[PDB]
Amino acid sequence: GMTNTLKTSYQKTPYKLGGNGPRNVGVLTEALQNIDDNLESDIYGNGAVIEDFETKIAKILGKQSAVFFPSGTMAQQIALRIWADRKENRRVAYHPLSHLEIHEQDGLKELQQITPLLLGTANQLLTIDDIKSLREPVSSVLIELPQREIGGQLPAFEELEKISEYCHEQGISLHLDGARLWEITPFYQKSAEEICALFDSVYVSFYKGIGGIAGAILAGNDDFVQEAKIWKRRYGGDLISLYPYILSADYYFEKRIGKMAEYFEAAKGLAERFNSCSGVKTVPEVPVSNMFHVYFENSADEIGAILTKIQDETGVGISGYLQEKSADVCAFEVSVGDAFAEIPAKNLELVFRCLEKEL
Amino acid sequence: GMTNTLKTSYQKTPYKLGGNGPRNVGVLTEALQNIDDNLESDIYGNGAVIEDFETKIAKILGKQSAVFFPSGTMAQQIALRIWADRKENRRVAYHPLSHLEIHEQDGLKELQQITPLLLGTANQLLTIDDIKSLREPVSSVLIELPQREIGGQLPAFEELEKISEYCHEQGISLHLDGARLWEITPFYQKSAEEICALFDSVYVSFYKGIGGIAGAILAGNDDFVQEAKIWKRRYGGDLISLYPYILSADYYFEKRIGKMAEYFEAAKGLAERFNSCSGVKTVPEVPVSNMFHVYFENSADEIGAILTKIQDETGVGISGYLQEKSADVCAFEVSVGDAFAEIPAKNLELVFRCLEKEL
Ligand SMILES: [Cl-]
Ligand code: NA
């Protein structure tokens, strides 16, 4: 049906609007080009290769220390448990579509017996008013900048300041799900340190906008990080050797961190072209990062046929899937990376000329 | 004090009695030399690179299915929870020095709310009487072959059969901590499959006797493995890309699985040399695997000085550490691998003539 035809069409395209190209073994071998084969492996959380990377990212985030984790899934459940223990309160609060709530097979609930109170509604940004309306106290609030499931939306920076100030006054710990932190500094015109300064703890990824292989850093005060390392061993995350992910994380960080503004500008240019099409809009209308969602006023079956024809005729991958939203509405996500800049101008123009012609 | 002096002396040695050479980036480089840079990454537990490896190991172990985990610490906690749910019983039983009990910061207790009953006494092998004598129902019994903390001791295969048979009649799940399973097939003259046939589930490692970088396989019935995959995501172990560990595990498995008999022989010969020295004895007296413990009748500081001198004068690393057992008794562990055969005969002989002399 539509699903498989679109998938196949997308997979065959030489060019892609989204991403950083194929996730293949070459991503790792490229990262190892400048590394000495005699470089010693880290050993259960210790050693220059891991310690130097932790110290470096901690300094970039303006925190006392950091711990390298195999995943954000592990790291964030642990962060919330530490704050629950400090406050003797197993309730937390976050957006209904937090990664913890929907993408971790209920790990936070099942492994930590933490009860998440959902803030606002699934379709919009949470606000300070939602926090003020909580019917019981919480140990922490978790904020995801930007809110990926609603298209990568952000509150005004001044509103994040007000949330931070209120949490400080009420003794509520504030944790940053910064999976896509690097991608938002251009819009906010704030450094990573400035944004993270409003939070007690922060998690950042190296495989999202950075385009590395896998891995995460959790950062905060020394005492906090030391407790996180104990939990890391409990979770089976204190692997003997994490260098394959540390080296690749550091390589791709240095390769792509300077491109965040470029990806933001590119995403905005692309969104303008989508919005110019009849029956097509983006959310947000003007991207505030390298990502956005594209919505259509037609069913997924109908749009899939159009996208397949266009991908086949231009060689430019638009999307490998379409999410059904209502009877006659569907959508997909775009995250701009290195692939966008490789699309020849003619092919890119043709995609939209064709899109405008088919709908 | 001699602790760091010994450690530095050991790290400088070009040859070593134990292990498989330096744990450096080169280990990864070598494993990737014959992999196509275009080979596609696994994606959150799916894809040929991960699926083919899991299938390969499951067949070797004689089980329906297998799941690759980043760690045995995560894998085994999960295995025990699964059996605990099946039996509605959160009590388990194992040796007092099980890895779950002493090396995982109490993860089993803290994350899985399981109560472990300790079988027998810390200084010796648990027996079938210890199991039959429990007089309280448990969901599972865990067996570690060999028992590493007491020198790598093994019960007779015939006793394992009886333990398996008893647990089967009583409805008790039997789990194998097979971190060092590969190392014991020579002594038992039984295949991995024949050993695993006695157990409901099994965990095996790829970084110990195999000498890979990191990683584990958990294997058993397909329904058991599917539940394990749910828990894997909850733990933060379902990394987008595990190929760096999978490809290296497979590479070193192929390289060294056939040398297990050789390592066993070599260990026996090395233990004989240790035992022939006054003031020195191995546990077990005769190794039943590639490993054993070496005990001395002097203090860690006194032995540390001697080993430091011998290491500096011969270029052969004996031990990087000493574990104090009492004021005047200390010990270390030796696990024979590829390093041993690379020691020139002259140097090896000089090591023992010095040990004979100094003690
Ligand atoms: Cl703190
Ligand atoms: Na090189």
Cross-chain CB nearest to B36 (options A25, A32, A35): A25
Token pair belonging to B8: 């530095």
Token code pair at residue A245: 């992910």
Contact A75 B236 (CB under 8 A): yes
**Shortest CB distance from A230 goes to which of B37, B43, B105?**
B105
Provide the token pair at A162.
């007000």
Q: How far is A196 from chain B (nearest CA, A)?
A: 23
Query: Judging by DSSP bridges, how do beta strands A140-144 and A173-178 pair with one another?
Result: parallel
Q: Which residues does chain A have within 8 Å of residue B240's beta carbon, measured at their own beta carbons?
A: 23, 207, 213-214
Q: Resolution in angstroms, to 1 decimal, for this deposition?
A: 1.8
Pairing of strands A15-16, A65-69: unpaired
Q: Which residues pair with A332 in a beta bridge?
A: A294
- Angle, CA B35 vertex, CA B33 and CA B37 arms, to 5°: 105
Question: Scanning the structure block, which residue is given the tokens 């039997």?
Answer: B174
Residues with CB in 5 Å of ion ligand 1: A 221, 223-224
Nearest CA in chain B to A109: B234
Structure tokens at B160: 């394992």
Query: Are the CB atoms for A234 and B107 separated by under 8 Å?
Result: yes
Nearest-neighbour CA in chain A from B82: distance (Å): 13
For chain B, how far is it from start to end, CA to CA, in angstroms?
19
Give the method of determination.
X-ray
- Walk me through the domains of chain B, giving residue ranges and CATH numbers: 1-255 (3.40.640.10), 256-359 (3.90.1150.10)
Read out DSSP for A134-149? -SS--SEEEEESSBGG
- Say how far apart CA A135 and CA B12 lie, in whole Å: 62
Alpha-helix runs per DSSP H in A32-71: 48-61
Gap from A137 CA to chain B (nearest CA, Å): 24
Which of the 8 DSSP states describes residue B39?
P
CA distance A311 to A320: 10
CB contact under 8 A, B29 and A23: no
Instruction: Give whole-number Cα distances, A278 to A296, A297, A318, A357, in Å.
Output: 9, 9, 17, 10
Residues in a beta bridge with A142: A175
Interchain CB distance below 8 Å, A235 and B239: no
B326 C-alpha to ligand 2 centroid (Å): 46
Quick count: other Cβ atoms within 10 Å of Cβ B245? Answer: 29
Q: For residue A37, how far is its CA from the centre of ligand 2 (angstroms)?
A: 6
Alpha-carbon gap, residue B179 to B98, rounded angstroms? 11
Distance B25 CA to ligand 2 centre (A): 9
Best probe of the A interface among B35, B229, B241, B245, by most A CBs < 10 A, is B241
Closest CA to B101 of B77, B120, B78: B77
Q: Do A244 and B71 touch (CB under 8 A)?
A: no
- The tokens for B77 are 């906690």
d(CA A135, CA B149): 52
* Whole-angstrom Cα Rg for chain A: 21
Choose among A242, A125, A123: nearest CA to B239.
A242
Of B4, B239, B242, B246, which to mutate for an interface test with A (greatest number of A Cβ within 10 Å)?
B239
Chain center to CA of A220: 19
